[model samples]
Target chain A: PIAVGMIETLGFPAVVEAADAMVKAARVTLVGYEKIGSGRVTVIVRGDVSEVQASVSAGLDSAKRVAGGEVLSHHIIARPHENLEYVLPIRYTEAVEQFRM
Target chain B: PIAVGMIETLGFPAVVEAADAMVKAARVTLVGYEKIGSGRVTVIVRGDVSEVQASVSAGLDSAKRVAGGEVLSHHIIARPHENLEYVLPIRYTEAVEQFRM
Candidate 1:
């Protein structure tokens, strides 16, 4: 089963980098990101629960390289659904099927 | 005369990224970073006036990747001292002389 992971950061570019590094560090797919006020962004990813965990870790560390970037908050759900994706935007979409994990 | 550049971020790690990339992007040396409040930090660098400007820009752009990182404020003083470093932690330290520009 797939799980969801999220990392919230402070700016546009920081979240973007979080997306890139998360996928490269694990078998995760970039679901997307969203703005949550205070100029913060929550970047989303999905994969196996273990992969989601690892991907979030890698994303946090990698983003620390950004000039003013910093990791603020993060969470991972062992199962992506259970009504979770329904409440949020964590659904594994169509165009991204080619990279599903 | 040397100048000081500063970037404020929301956490310990984000300022770290800003410090690292700032030095690599220009001839600036990592003077340090400071704690303010609300889990925020201000990273500092010093170098030629021009290099400080370049360094500050690089730091802000590079910090965009941190998972929870966010840049709050930034400034560059064209010339150091005149009671500035004395008012803050922007001093170019002795041990850092080896990397000074």
Candidate 2:
């Protein structure tokens, strides 16, 4: 992954919308999603630093528009540590291959 | 599953320790583990209502002992909605059958 962008939301549907928005907003790939109990969910995307930033911005804006949606946290890492890719689920997946930039 | 118990922690190692302690402390099966970014992780267990309560208690106590561990949230649901079992990752898997109560 060149750069990583993430948006954490309070609900599943909100996070799903964020993922779609992020990929649609820029030349990025919707890499993965995470669910934490208490309705917390996060969507991850990867692309160039500038693209990732744009993706996250669009994702946050779109997620907020979803019914009952609430964005909790969002971040973009220009170059995440390699170990994070191995340990975390932020790496590119076969399912998202078609969306990869 | 008759009941479900969950313990959310701030680190992976702590959540792992919580899972191990949960299964060892009572007749509960370590059903699932979930990760949300920012180092938040949760371990889930399932069993009888009383057993799940005990398991969660033990898990919380043990997780806190892990170095750099931080408990975020903990809860026990005596009877979770059936739909949750299908949509959530809190279901018992064949790999954990041996530990089923």
Candidate 3:
């Protein structure tokens, strides 16, 4: 079973930092980066449910410390619908396969 | 020379419809599709100023007709800053090159 964690931020740099922290903090893979305009961005991570929770928590703390960082929302889905992997950019890419846990 | 037209909608399907109508309505290219989460999505088009304007208008009308569609915002930029092309998803991709105007 796969779990997904998402953290939305107010700037590109902040979200990037969050992603880096998430992958470093736990056995997780950074899967997606989304921009919603108006300076809002989100980074997605995947791991076991417990690992995802830890990763998201670490990401929130790290993102908040960025100079101009502002967290808009954060969520964890224990088991996201399989259909979402096709419609959304939350799937792991080949480039990041090496980082998969 | 390029002009950019953007239409924001409340659903993914609506944005897809907007992109299709925008390209069919005028001499414009569907350059990008952006999703910001919370059901907010945007479609980007490029062409001459007048063409972009017409395309956006048609997109708005068509998107509104989608069963679950709702238009959030729409705008046209006669000449967008070049830097935006690199940072944003508004740039034309090689896959869509054939549709370029």
Candidate 4:
């Protein structure tokens, strides 16, 4: 088992709190990461693919529950196998808009 | 059996593209849906809980692949029996072959 990389951007500051809450709630072990030029905090995490996904989902939900916040963008960068690449990005805003009309 | 309520938001035309890809890839039979007060789209689908969940996951995976994307939020809204609701949303590229990892 290798590792999967995932990141989600929360719309409001509450998202930060929610993200932190997830860390506490899920108790995921953090590995390491570096700051990007975009000021986008790239928090690095590691674990079984399923568990990491579950923890992120839980974190997002907890963040949403805080001050009625919600997830905006979510990305999953996974390399289940060395030669294999899995990249997924999900946007909630667009869906809400599309579902609007 | 009953149904669980879950939803995920995707971004970009690619996400839309990915969503459709998933639909076709999984060949899911969509049942119904409604417009929420917030202009949100809530689609109602029915089937063997596992099948429905599996199909949705496939649909999402396919949709993401079309634009080289991945899933954002996966929610399994289920209750276990009439009283039975089991919703499993899987994000993946391949079904690990049985007895073959």
Decoy 3 TM-score against native: 0.53
Regions more than 4 Å wrong, model 2: A1-39, A42-101
**Candidate 1 vs 2: which has more TM-score:** 2
Error of 1 at B16 (Å): 0.8
Order of the predicted models by lDDT, top scorer first: 3, 2, 1, 4
**Residue pairs clashing, model 3:** none
- How high is each candidate's TM-score? 0.52, 0.53, 0.53, 0.33
Per-residue lDDT tens digits of candidate 2, residues B22-52?
9898999887877656676678888999998
lDDT of 1 by residue, A1-101 (tens): 67777777777788888999899999999877655446667778888888888998898888878988976766665643222232235677887888996
Give each model's whole-structure lDDT: 0.73, 0.77, 0.79, 0.39
Angstrom error at residue A34, model 4:
8.3
Per-residue error for A17 in candidate 1, Å, reads 25
Off by over 4 Å in 1: A1-101
CAPRI class assigned to model 2: incorrect
Interface RMSD of each: 14.8, 10.1, 9.8, 13.6
lDDT of 3 by residue, A1-101 (tens): 79888787878899999999998889999978876666767788999999998998999899999998898666676765443454356778998899898
Residue-pair clashes per prediction, in order, are: 19, 0, 0, 17
lDDT head-to-head 1 vs 4, winner: 1
Model 3 chain A worst lDDT window (10 residues): A80-89
Q: Of the native A-B interface contacts, what share survives in model 2?
A: 0.05
lDDT of 2 by residue, A1-101 (tens): 39999999865545655766677778877777677666678878788999999989998998788545679999999989989988998988765676666
Instruction: State the RMSD for candidate 3.
Output: 10.3
